[PDB]
Design a protein around this motif. Structure first.
Motif, PDB file in Angstrom:
ATOM      1  N   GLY A  94       0.821  -1.204   0.000  1.00 23.22           N
ATOM      2  CA  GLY A  94       0.000   0.000   0.000  1.00 23.22           C
ATOM      3  C   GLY A  94       0.860   1.261   0.000  1.00 23.22           C
ATOM      4  O   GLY A  94       0.543   2.233  -0.685  1.00 23.22           O
ATOM      5  N   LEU A  95       1.942   1.251   0.774  1.00 22.39           N
ATOM      6  CA  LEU A  95       2.816   2.419   0.841  1.00 22.39           C
ATOM      7  C   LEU A  95       3.686   2.515  -0.409  1.00 22.39           C
ATOM      8  O   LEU A  95       4.131   3.600  -0.782  1.00 22.39           O
ATOM      9  CB  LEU A  95       3.693   2.360   2.100  1.00 22.39           C
ATOM     10  N   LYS A  96       3.920   1.379  -1.055  1.00 26.73           N
ATOM     11  CA  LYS A  96       4.729   1.362  -2.265  1.00 26.73           C
ATOM     12  C   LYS A  96       4.005   2.096  -3.387  1.00 26.73           C
ATOM     13  O   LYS A  96       4.634   2.658  -4.284  1.00 26.73           O
ATOM     14  CB  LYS A  96       5.023  -0.084  -2.685  1.00 26.73           C
ATOM     15  N   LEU A  97       2.676   2.088  -3.329  1.00 26.98           N
ATOM     16  CA  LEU A  97       1.875   2.757  -4.348  1.00 26.98           C
ATOM     17  C   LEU A  97       2.189   4.251  -4.371  1.00 26.98           C
ATOM     18  O   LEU A  97       2.567   4.799  -5.406  1.00 26.98           O
ATOM     19  CB  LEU A  97       0.380   2.543  -4.054  1.00 26.98           C
ATOM     20  N   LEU A  98       2.031   4.901  -3.222  1.00 29.58           N
ATOM     21  CA  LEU A  98       2.302   6.331  -3.119  1.00 29.58           C
ATOM     22  C   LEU A  98       2.058   6.821  -1.695  1.00 29.58           C
ATOM     23  O   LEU A  98       1.666   7.968  -1.487  1.00 29.58           O
ATOM     24  CB  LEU A  98       1.404   7.109  -4.089  1.00 29.58           C
TER      25      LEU A  98
END
Length: 13
Positions: free
Chosen positions: A9-13
């Motif tokens: 989820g954090l890798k998305l943005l």
């Protein structure tokens, strides 16, 4: 683990 999804989820943005 449900936490795994958050990791990406954090890798998305």
């Amino acid at each position: 683990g449900l936490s795994l999804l958050l990791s990406l989820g954090l890798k998305l943005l």
